Design a protein around this motif. Structure first.
Motif, PDB file in Angstrom:
ATOM      1  N   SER B   4      10.352-173.633  -9.441  1.00 31.12           N
ATOM      2  CA  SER B   4      11.298-172.531  -9.475  1.00 31.12           C
ATOM      3  C   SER B   4      10.680-171.167  -9.132  1.00 31.12           C
ATOM      4  O   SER B   4      11.432-170.199  -8.977  1.00 31.12           O
ATOM      5  CB  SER B   4      11.944-172.476 -10.863  1.00 31.12           C
ATOM      6  N   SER B   5       9.352-171.064  -8.988  1.00 35.21           N
ATOM      7  CA  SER B   5       8.680-169.778  -8.838  1.00 35.21           C
ATOM      8  C   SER B   5       8.283-169.461  -7.398  1.00 35.21           C
ATOM      9  O   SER B   5       7.469-168.555  -7.179  1.00 35.21           O
ATOM     10  CB  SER B   5       7.440-169.739  -9.727  1.00 35.21           C
ATOM     11  N   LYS B  83      22.950-170.352  -5.364  1.00 33.09           N
ATOM     12  CA  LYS B  83      24.272-170.256  -5.964  1.00 33.09           C
ATOM     13  C   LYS B  83      24.853-168.909  -5.572  1.00 33.09           C
ATOM     14  O   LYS B  83      24.414-167.867  -6.070  1.00 33.09           O
ATOM     15  CB  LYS B  83      24.220-170.387  -7.480  1.00 33.09           C
ATOM     16  N   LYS B  85      26.932-165.832  -5.760  1.00 31.76           N
ATOM     17  CA  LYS B  85      27.611-165.056  -6.790  1.00 31.76           C
ATOM     18  C   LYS B  85      28.638-164.110  -6.186  1.00 31.76           C
ATOM     19  O   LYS B  85      29.825-164.189  -6.524  1.00 31.76           O
ATOM     20  CB  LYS B  85      26.597-164.262  -7.611  1.00 31.76           C
ATOM     21  N   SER B 107      22.042-166.559  -6.927  1.00 30.09           N
ATOM     22  CA  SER B 107      21.089-167.130  -7.842  1.00 30.09           C
ATOM     23  C   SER B 107      20.250-168.149  -7.106  1.00 30.09           C
ATOM     24  O   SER B 107      20.779-168.967  -6.345  1.00 30.09           O
ATOM     25  CB  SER B 107      21.776-167.805  -8.984  1.00 30.09           C
ATOM     26  N   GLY B 109      16.659-170.573  -8.188  1.00 26.06           N
ATOM     27  CA  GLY B 109      15.679-170.969  -9.189  1.00 26.06           C
ATOM     28  C   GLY B 109      15.981-170.428 -10.571  1.00 26.06           C
ATOM     29  O   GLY B 109      15.124-170.475 -11.475  1.00 26.06           O
ATOM     30  N   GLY B 110      17.216-169.931 -10.745  1.00 27.87           N
ATOM     31  CA  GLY B 110      17.646-169.223 -11.930  1.00 27.87           C
ATOM     32  C   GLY B 110      17.359-167.744 -11.903  1.00 27.87           C
ATOM     33  O   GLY B 110      17.567-167.062 -12.917  1.00 27.87           O
ATOM     34  N   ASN B 111      16.874-167.231 -10.788  1.00 28.48           N
ATOM     35  CA  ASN B 111      16.540-165.830 -10.639  1.00 28.48           C
ATOM     36  C   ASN B 111      17.692-165.148  -9.915  1.00 28.48           C
ATOM     37  O   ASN B 111      18.186-165.669  -8.908  1.00 28.48           O
ATOM     38  CB  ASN B 111      15.231-165.678  -9.854  1.00 28.48           C
ATOM     39  N   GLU B 112      18.120-163.983 -10.429  1.00 25.77           N
ATOM     40  CA  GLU B 112      19.164-163.190  -9.781  1.00 25.77           C
ATOM     41  C   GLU B 112      18.576-162.478  -8.588  1.00 25.77           C
ATOM     42  O   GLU B 112      17.580-161.766  -8.709  1.00 25.77           O
ATOM     43  CB  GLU B 112      19.758-162.164 -10.747  1.00 25.77           C
ATOM     44  N   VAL B 251       8.140-165.558  -7.416  1.00 32.34           N
ATOM     45  CA  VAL B 251       8.948-164.924  -8.461  1.00 32.34           C
ATOM     46  C   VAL B 251       8.257-165.178  -9.809  1.00 32.34           C
ATOM     47  O   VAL B 251       7.994-166.332 -10.174  1.00 32.34           O
ATOM     48  CB  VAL B 251      10.376-165.495  -8.447  1.00 32.34           C
TER      49      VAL B 251
END
Ligand code: CA
Lengths: 75, 253
Positions: B4-5, B83, B85, B107, B109-112, B251
Motif C-alpha cells: 500500500s506504500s 477509488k 471520490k 483513494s 492504498g487507503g490514502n486520500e 506514501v
C-alpha cells in the motif's frame, strides 16, 4: 531523521498489506488507511499488536514497533 | 502480500493534434501503459478518437476527461486500485487554447489523493499566460485539505527561468525531478535530436513535462523517474513528440 518503518497488517483472511509509517505518527492514521483500502469500518474490526489492543493515540515509537512488524486485525 | 506504500503513474502529452499515424501511435501508448500498469495515467492533448481507443484498449482504467471537444486532458484510474471520490474542473479564464485544470479526488492504498493535470498554455509568445496558469495551479494545490496529498503532473510547456520569474514553487511544493537530484537521463521530456515526430531538425529541447506535489516532509517520497515511449513504432515514429514520464513514489503515514 527522514526515517519511517514498514508495518504489515495481517487479516484473519490471510491478506497481508504493507504500509510505511513514521515512528511518531499516531497509529489511527494507519487504522483509518486500512479501513479505506479494504472497505471496512472501524466498528467491525479491531487491531492488536503483540497481544495488546491499539489506542488510536499510540505511536509505533511508544509501542516500540520495529521495521517489518505485523499488526493483527480481527473481525 | 500487498504494498500500500508505493504508487505509480505516468504523465504524457500524446500529441492528439498529429492526425497521421493516429491508430498506430495510440496502440503504442497503450502498450507502454500495459508494460508498466500504472495506478494513474495523466494524459494531455487527447482527442475524441484517442479516447475511444482507450475505452476498449485500456478498458482496465476508468476515464475522466477535461472536456469533450477538440483536444483536452484526461486522468485514467486503475479499476480496483483507485477509488474515485470526486472530480472538478477549474477554468483558465484567459486561455486562448481551451486549457484548464482537471482535478480528481481519489483513494489509493487507503490514502486520500487529489490528482491534477493540465496542459498549460503553449508557445514562447504566450509565456505571460503560461505563468498565470502556473500560479493558479500552484494556487489550487494549496487550497486542498491538509489531510489529502496533492499530485500534479502535466505538460507545463515551461521554459528555463520562467518558474524563476513566476516567483518559484512555494514552500510545501516540490518538483519530483528536482527532488531526485535532477537526473540526466530523464532531464528532457521534449527532445528533437532523439525524436523525429514533428520533423524539425534544429536541436531544441526542454523539460515541458513536470511533476509537482504538495505534502508534509517525508510523507510523499519520489523513488524514481524515467522516460517512457522511447520505442520506435512500426512506421518508424515514436508514440508522441513528447517522452512520457513514469514516476514511482512512497506514501508514508
Ligand atoms: Ca502537439
Amino acid at each position: 531523521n527522514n526515517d519511517h518503518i514498514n508495518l504489515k497488517v495481517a487479516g484473519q483472511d490471510g491478506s497481508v498489506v504493507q504500509f510505511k509509517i513514521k515512528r511518531h505518527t499516531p497509529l489511527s492514521k494507519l487504522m483509518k488507511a486500512y479501513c479505506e483500502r479494504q472497505g471496512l469500518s472501524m466498528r467491525q474490526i479491531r487491531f492488536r499488536f503483540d497481544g495488546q489492543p491499539i489506542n488510536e493515540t499510540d505511536t509505533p515509537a511508544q509501542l516500540e514497533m520495529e521495521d517489518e512488524d505485523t499488526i493483527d486485525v480481527f473481525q | 502480500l500487498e504494498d500500500s506504500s508505493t504508487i505509480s503513474f505516468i504523465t504524457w502529452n500524446i500529441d492528439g493534434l498529429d492526425g497521421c499515424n493516429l491508430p498506430e501511435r495510440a496502440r503504442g501508448v497503450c502498450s507502454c501503459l500495459a508494460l508498466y500498469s500504472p495506478d494513474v495515467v495523466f494524459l494531455q492533448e487527447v482527442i475524441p478518437p484517442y479516447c475511444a481507443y482507450l475505452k476498449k484498449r485500456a478498458a482496465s482504467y476508468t476515464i475522466i476527461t477535461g472536456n469533450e471537444e477538440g483536444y483536452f486532458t484526461a486522468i485514467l484510474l486503475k479499476k480496483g486500485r483507485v477509488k474515485f471520490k470526486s472530480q472538478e474542473i477549474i477554468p483558465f479564464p484567459n486561455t486562448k487554447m481551451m486549457r484548464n485544470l482537471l482535478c480528481v479526488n481519489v483513494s489509493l492504498g487507503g490514502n486520500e489523493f487529489c490528482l491534477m493535470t493540465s496542459h498549460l498554455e503553449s508557445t514562447r509568445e504566450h509565456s505571460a499566460e503560461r505563468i498565470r496558469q502556473l500560479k493558479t495551479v500552484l494556487g489550487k494545490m494549496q487550497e486542498a485539505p491538509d489531510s489529502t496529498t496533492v499530485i500534479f503532473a502535466g505538460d507545463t510547456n515551461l521554459r528555463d527561468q520562467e518558474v524563476i520569474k513566476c516567483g518559484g514553487l512555494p514552500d510545501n511544493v516540490f518538483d519530483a525531478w528536482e527532488f531526485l537530484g535532477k537526473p540526466k537521463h530523464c532531464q528532457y521530456t521534449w527532445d528533437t535530436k532523439a525524436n523525429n515526430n514533428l520533423r524539425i531538425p534544429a536541436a531544441y529541447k526542454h523539460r515541458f513535462d513536470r511533476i509537482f506535489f504538495r505534502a508534509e516532509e517525508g510523507h510523499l517520497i519520489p523513488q524514481s523517474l524515467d522516460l517512457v515511449g522511447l520505442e520506435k513504432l512500426d512506421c518508424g515514429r515514436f508514440p508522441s513528440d513528447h517522452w512520457g514520464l513514469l514516476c514511482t513514489l512512497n506514501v508514508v503515514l
